[PDB]
mmCIF file of all heavy atoms in Angstrom:
data_model
loop_
_atom_site.group_PDB
_atom_site.id
_atom_site.type_symbol
_atom_site.label_atom_id
_atom_site.label_comp_id
_atom_site.label_asym_id
_atom_site.label_seq_id
_atom_site.Cartn_x
_atom_site.Cartn_y
_atom_site.Cartn_z
ATOM 1 N N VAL A 558 0.831 -1.170 0.031
ATOM 2 C CA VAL A 558 -0.029 -0.009 -0.020
ATOM 3 C C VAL A 558 0.906 1.262 -0.005
ATOM 4 O O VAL A 558 0.450 2.291 -0.582
ATOM 5 C CB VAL A 558 -1.015 -0.006 1.181
ATOM 6 C CG1 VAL A 558 -1.827 -1.253 1.197
ATOM 7 C CG2 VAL A 558 -0.323 0.269 2.512
ATOM 8 N N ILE A 559 2.033 1.156 0.641
ATOM 9 C CA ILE A 559 2.995 2.276 0.512
ATOM 10 C C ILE A 559 3.523 2.311 -0.927
ATOM 11 O O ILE A 559 3.385 3.348 -1.552
ATOM 12 C CB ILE A 559 4.217 2.076 1.458
ATOM 13 C CG1 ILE A 559 3.745 1.883 2.924
ATOM 14 C CG2 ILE A 559 5.135 3.300 1.330
ATOM 15 C CD1 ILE A 559 3.331 3.184 3.664
ATOM 16 N N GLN A 560 4.017 1.240 -1.448
ATOM 17 C CA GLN A 560 4.631 1.193 -2.743
ATOM 18 C C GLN A 560 3.651 1.604 -3.831
ATOM 19 O O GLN A 560 3.971 2.372 -4.742
ATOM 20 C CB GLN A 560 5.199 -0.181 -3.075
ATOM 21 C CG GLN A 560 6.012 -0.274 -4.371
ATOM 22 C CD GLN A 560 6.350 -1.672 -4.780
ATOM 23 O OE1 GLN A 560 6.064 -2.645 -4.079
ATOM 24 N NE2 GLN A 560 6.931 -1.837 -5.993
ATOM 25 N N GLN A 561 2.446 1.078 -3.751
ATOM 26 C CA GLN A 561 1.379 1.389 -4.693
ATOM 27 C C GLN A 561 0.858 2.836 -4.542
ATOM 28 O O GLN A 561 0.744 3.569 -5.525
ATOM 29 C CB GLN A 561 0.227 0.368 -4.542
ATOM 30 C CG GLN A 561 0.465 -0.905 -5.281
ATOM 31 C CD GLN A 561 -0.318 -2.100 -4.831
ATOM 32 O OE1 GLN A 561 -0.103 -3.254 -5.272
ATOM 33 N NE2 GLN A 561 -1.276 -1.876 -3.933
ATOM 34 N N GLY A 562 0.595 3.227 -3.290
ATOM 35 C CA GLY A 562 0.058 4.555 -2.999
ATOM 36 C C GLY A 562 0.947 5.679 -3.554
ATOM 37 O O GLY A 562 0.502 6.779 -3.903
ATOM 38 N N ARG A 563 2.255 5.417 -3.520
ATOM 39 C CA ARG A 563 3.233 6.407 -4.025
ATOM 40 C C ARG A 563 3.188 6.463 -5.570
ATOM 41 O O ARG A 563 3.484 7.516 -6.142
ATOM 42 C CB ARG A 563 4.669 5.997 -3.623
ATOM 43 C CG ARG A 563 4.844 5.858 -2.127
ATOM 44 C CD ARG A 563 6.271 5.413 -1.796
ATOM 45 N NE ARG A 563 7.261 6.126 -2.555
ATOM 46 C CZ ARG A 563 7.696 7.360 -2.220
ATOM 47 N NH1 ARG A 563 7.315 7.954 -1.104
ATOM 48 N NH2 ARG A 563 8.613 7.962 -2.956
ATOM 49 N N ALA A 564 2.802 5.379 -6.237
ATOM 50 C CA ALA A 564 2.709 5.320 -7.686
ATOM 51 C C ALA A 564 1.411 5.993 -8.135
ATOM 52 O O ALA A 564 1.362 6.624 -9.168
ATOM 53 C CB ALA A 564 2.846 3.915 -8.191
ATOM 54 N N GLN A 565 0.386 5.782 -7.319
ATOM 55 C CA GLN A 565 -0.876 6.509 -7.523
ATOM 56 C C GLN A 565 -0.711 7.983 -7.589
ATOM 57 O O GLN A 565 -1.248 8.663 -8.465
ATOM 58 C CB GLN A 565 -1.837 6.131 -6.438
ATOM 59 C CG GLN A 565 -3.145 6.880 -6.438
ATOM 60 C CD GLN A 565 -4.120 6.444 -5.358
ATOM 61 O OE1 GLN A 565 -3.930 5.350 -4.778
ATOM 62 N NE2 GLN A 565 -5.063 7.297 -5.005
ATOM 63 N N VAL A 566 0.048 8.515 -6.662
ATOM 64 C CA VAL A 566 0.329 9.962 -6.582
ATOM 65 C C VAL A 566 0.929 10.424 -7.915
ATOM 66 O O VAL A 566 0.502 11.432 -8.510
ATOM 67 C CB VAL A 566 1.315 10.253 -5.440
ATOM 68 C CG1 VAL A 566 2.095 11.562 -5.722
ATOM 69 C CG2 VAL A 566 0.573 10.403 -4.134
ATOM 70 N N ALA A 567 1.904 9.656 -8.454
ATOM 71 C CA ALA A 567 2.513 9.986 -9.739
ATOM 72 C C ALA A 567 1.547 9.799 -10.888
ATOM 73 O O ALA A 567 1.551 10.531 -11.854
ATOM 74 C CB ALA A 567 3.780 9.196 -9.927
ATOM 75 N N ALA A 568 0.738 8.731 -10.811
ATOM 76 C CA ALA A 568 -0.217 8.467 -11.877
ATOM 77 C C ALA A 568 -1.359 9.489 -11.880
ATOM 78 O O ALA A 568 -1.649 10.023 -12.977
ATOM 79 C CB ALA A 568 -0.843 7.075 -11.678
ATOM 80 N N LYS A 569 -1.857 9.808 -10.757
ATOM 81 C CA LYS A 569 -2.946 10.853 -10.673
ATOM 82 C C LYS A 569 -2.465 12.179 -11.231
ATOM 83 O O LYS A 569 -3.296 13.037 -11.622
ATOM 84 C CB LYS A 569 -3.349 11.091 -9.242
ATOM 85 C CG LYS A 569 -4.131 9.942 -8.550
ATOM 86 C CD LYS A 569 -4.903 10.527 -7.330
ATOM 87 C CE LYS A 569 -4.000 11.147 -6.327
ATOM 88 N NZ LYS A 569 -3.775 10.297 -5.124
ATOM 89 N N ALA A 570 -1.174 12.409 -11.249
ATOM 90 C CA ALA A 570 -0.582 13.737 -11.594
ATOM 91 C C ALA A 570 -0.438 13.982 -13.065
ATOM 92 O O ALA A 570 -0.515 13.053 -13.902
ATOM 93 C CB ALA A 570 0.761 13.888 -10.894
ATOM 94 N N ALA A 571 -0.262 15.252 -13.422
ATOM 95 C CA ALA A 571 -0.122 15.625 -14.799
ATOM 96 C C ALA A 571 1.140 15.045 -15.398
ATOM 97 O O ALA A 571 2.049 14.604 -14.675
ATOM 98 C CB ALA A 571 -0.077 17.159 -14.901
ATOM 99 N N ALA A 572 1.193 15.046 -16.742
ATOM 100 C CA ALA A 572 2.283 14.403 -17.508
ATOM 101 C C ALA A 572 3.675 14.885 -17.137
ATOM 102 O O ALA A 572 3.885 16.066 -16.840
ATOM 103 C CB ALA A 572 2.022 14.521 -18.973
ATOM 104 N N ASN A 573 4.650 13.973 -17.196
ATOM 105 C CA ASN A 573 6.060 14.315 -17.057
ATOM 106 C C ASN A 573 6.575 14.902 -18.383
ATOM 107 O O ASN A 573 5.969 14.652 -19.462
ATOM 108 C CB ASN A 573 6.846 13.004 -16.830
ATOM 109 C CG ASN A 573 7.260 12.871 -15.407
ATOM 110 O OD1 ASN A 573 7.201 13.812 -14.623
ATOM 111 N ND2 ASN A 573 7.694 11.652 -15.036
ATOM 112 N N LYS A 574 7.679 15.628 -18.346
ATOM 113 C CA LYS A 574 8.322 16.064 -19.591
ATOM 114 C C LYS A 574 8.774 14.808 -20.349
ATOM 115 O O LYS A 574 8.729 14.781 -21.607
ATOM 116 C CB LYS A 574 9.574 16.927 -19.265
ATOM 117 C CG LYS A 574 9.180 18.294 -18.715
ATOM 118 C CD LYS A 574 10.398 19.244 -18.827
ATOM 119 C CE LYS A 574 10.007 20.690 -18.558
ATOM 120 N NZ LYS A 574 11.177 21.596 -18.629
ATOM 121 N N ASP A 575 9.206 13.787 -19.601
ATOM 122 C CA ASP A 575 9.609 12.550 -20.237
ATOM 123 C C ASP A 575 8.356 11.776 -20.783
ATOM 124 O O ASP A 575 8.430 11.180 -21.837
ATOM 125 C CB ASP A 575 10.323 11.639 -19.249
ATOM 126 C CG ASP A 575 11.707 12.115 -18.940
ATOM 127 O OD1 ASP A 575 12.428 12.463 -19.906
ATOM 128 O OD2 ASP A 575 12.096 12.228 -17.757
ATOM 129 N N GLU A 576 7.258 11.897 -20.065
ATOM 130 C CA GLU A 576 5.989 11.264 -20.502
ATOM 131 C C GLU A 576 5.482 11.989 -21.743
ATOM 132 O O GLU A 576 5.080 11.320 -22.688
ATOM 133 C CB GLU A 576 4.959 11.278 -19.365
ATOM 134 C CG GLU A 576 3.745 10.451 -19.684
ATOM 135 C CD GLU A 576 2.845 10.290 -18.439
ATOM 136 O OE1 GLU A 576 3.253 10.740 -17.337
ATOM 137 O OE2 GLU A 576 1.791 9.640 -18.522
ATOM 138 N N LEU A 577 5.550 13.268 -21.749
ATOM 139 C CA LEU A 577 5.133 14.077 -22.892
ATOM 140 C C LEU A 577 5.992 13.737 -24.094
ATOM 141 O O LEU A 577 5.486 13.543 -25.167
ATOM 142 C CB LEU A 577 5.246 15.576 -22.578
ATOM 143 C CG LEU A 577 4.230 16.110 -21.595
ATOM 144 C CD1 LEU A 577 4.427 17.577 -21.353
ATOM 145 C CD2 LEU A 577 2.823 15.868 -22.184
ATOM 146 N N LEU A 578 7.308 13.650 -23.862
ATOM 147 C CA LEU A 578 8.284 13.408 -24.955
ATOM 148 C C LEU A 578 8.022 12.038 -25.582
ATOM 149 O O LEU A 578 8.069 11.947 -26.808
ATOM 150 C CB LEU A 578 9.691 13.508 -24.356
ATOM 151 C CG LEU A 578 10.823 13.447 -25.441
ATOM 152 C CD1 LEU A 578 10.526 14.422 -26.566
ATOM 153 C CD2 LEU A 578 12.187 13.722 -24.801
ATOM 154 N N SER A 579 7.793 11.044 -24.794
ATOM 155 C CA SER A 579 7.517 9.693 -25.301
ATOM 156 C C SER A 579 6.223 9.617 -26.085
ATOM 157 O O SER A 579 6.078 8.762 -26.978
ATOM 158 C CB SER A 579 7.605 8.670 -24.181
ATOM 159 O OG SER A 579 6.716 8.977 -23.116
ATOM 160 N N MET A 580 5.297 10.510 -25.721
ATOM 161 C CA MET A 580 4.055 10.588 -26.502
ATOM 162 C C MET A 580 4.335 11.196 -27.883
ATOM 163 O O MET A 580 3.865 10.704 -28.883
ATOM 164 C CB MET A 580 3.014 11.485 -25.771
ATOM 165 C CG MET A 580 2.259 10.761 -24.653
ATOM 166 S SD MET A 580 1.550 11.942 -23.529
ATOM 167 C CE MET A 580 0.696 13.020 -24.656
ATOM 168 N N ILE A 581 5.087 12.318 -27.904
ATOM 169 C CA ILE A 581 5.543 12.960 -29.131
ATOM 170 C C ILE A 581 6.295 12.052 -30.045
ATOM 171 O O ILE A 581 6.154 12.103 -31.256
ATOM 172 C CB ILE A 581 6.359 14.254 -28.774
ATOM 173 C CG1 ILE A 581 5.508 15.222 -27.996
ATOM 174 C CG2 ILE A 581 6.882 14.877 -30.073
ATOM 175 C CD1 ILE A 581 6.323 16.422 -27.464
ATOM 176 N N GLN A 582 7.217 11.233 -29.486
ATOM 177 C CA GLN A 582 8.138 10.487 -30.266
ATOM 178 C C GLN A 582 7.517 9.209 -30.790
ATOM 179 O O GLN A 582 7.955 8.635 -31.767
ATOM 180 C CB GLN A 582 9.363 10.119 -29.426
ATOM 181 C CG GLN A 582 10.211 11.314 -29.049
ATOM 182 C CD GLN A 582 11.241 10.959 -28.000
ATOM 183 O OE1 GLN A 582 11.050 10.040 -27.193
ATOM 184 N NE2 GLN A 582 12.289 11.722 -27.940
ATOM 185 N N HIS A 583 6.459 8.728 -30.119
ATOM 186 C CA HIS A 583 5.858 7.439 -30.535
ATOM 187 C C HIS A 583 5.285 7.417 -31.921
ATOM 188 O O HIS A 583 4.314 8.084 -32.246
ATOM 189 C CB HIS A 583 4.754 7.046 -29.513
ATOM 190 C CG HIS A 583 4.112 5.725 -29.843
ATOM 191 N ND1 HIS A 583 4.593 4.489 -29.387
ATOM 192 C CD2 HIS A 583 3.007 5.431 -30.563
ATOM 193 C CE1 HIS A 583 3.802 3.524 -29.792
ATOM 194 N NE2 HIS A 583 2.848 4.062 -30.540
ATOM 195 N N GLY A 584 6.061 6.727 -32.807
ATOM 196 C CA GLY A 584 5.661 6.607 -34.223
ATOM 197 C C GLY A 584 6.203 7.710 -35.094
ATOM 198 O O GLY A 584 6.003 7.717 -36.267
ATOM 199 N N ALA A 585 6.931 8.609 -34.427
ATOM 200 C CA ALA A 585 7.532 9.739 -35.139
ATOM 201 C C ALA A 585 8.443 9.361 -36.335
ATOM 202 O O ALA A 585 8.445 9.977 -37.347
ATOM 203 C CB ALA A 585 8.299 10.639 -34.136
ATOM 204 N N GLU A 586 9.182 8.223 -36.102
ATOM 205 C CA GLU A 586 10.036 7.742 -37.191
ATOM 206 C C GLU A 586 9.258 7.296 -38.383
ATOM 207 O O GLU A 586 9.506 7.754 -39.492
ATOM 208 C CB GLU A 586 10.872 6.529 -36.697
ATOM 209 C CG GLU A 586 11.502 5.738 -37.815
ATOM 210 C CD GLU A 586 12.285 4.508 -37.317
ATOM 211 O OE1 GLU A 586 12.429 4.303 -36.087
ATOM 212 O OE2 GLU A 586 12.747 3.743 -38.174
ATOM 213 N N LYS A 587 8.326 6.363 -38.157
ATOM 214 C CA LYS A 587 7.495 5.800 -39.244
ATOM 215 C C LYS A 587 6.730 6.918 -39.998
ATOM 216 O O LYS A 587 6.468 6.734 -41.203
ATOM 217 C CB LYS A 587 6.555 4.758 -38.697
ATOM 218 C CG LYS A 587 7.217 3.667 -37.943
ATOM 219 C CD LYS A 587 6.207 2.760 -37.156
ATOM 220 C CE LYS A 587 6.969 1.778 -36.239
ATOM 221 N NZ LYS A 587 6.043 1.008 -35.399
ATOM 222 N N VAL A 588 6.366 8.006 -39.315
ATOM 223 C CA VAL A 588 5.719 9.095 -39.923
ATOM 224 C C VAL A 588 6.665 9.836 -40.833
ATOM 225 O O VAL A 588 6.311 10.129 -42.043
ATOM 226 C CB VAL A 588 5.160 10.054 -38.876
ATOM 227 C CG1 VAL A 588 4.828 11.423 -39.465
ATOM 228 C CG2 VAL A 588 3.944 9.452 -38.220
ATOM 229 N N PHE A 589 7.903 10.149 -40.386
ATOM 230 C CA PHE A 589 8.893 10.770 -41.212
ATOM 231 C C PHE A 589 9.274 9.941 -42.391
ATOM 232 O O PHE A 589 9.536 10.482 -43.496
ATOM 233 C CB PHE A 589 10.158 11.035 -40.385
ATOM 234 C CG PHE A 589 10.116 12.268 -39.577
ATOM 235 C CD1 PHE A 589 10.676 12.325 -38.309
ATOM 236 C CD2 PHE A 589 9.606 13.483 -40.123
ATOM 237 C CE1 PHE A 589 10.593 13.453 -37.553
ATOM 238 C CE2 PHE A 589 9.568 14.604 -39.386
ATOM 239 C CZ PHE A 589 10.067 14.594 -38.130
#
């Protein structure tokens, strides 16, 4: 419940710069 509850906090939260970036990059190659 500690380990999970801490992940919930991160999940409930707005996107990471890394999370945003991986969204932007996903399929970017095949598109180009």
Side-chain angles (χ1 to χ4, degrees):
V558 306
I559 305 282
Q560 187 189 357
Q561 278 160 188
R563 304 178 44 83
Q565 174 176 344
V566 154
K569 291 202 298 259
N573 256 347
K574 291 196 168 180
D575 287 315
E576 189 167 359
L577 288 180
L578 187 50
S579 52
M580 280 161 50
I581 298 172
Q582 295 168 334
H583 180 90
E586 165 183 354
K587 303 167 188 176
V588 163
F589 275 140

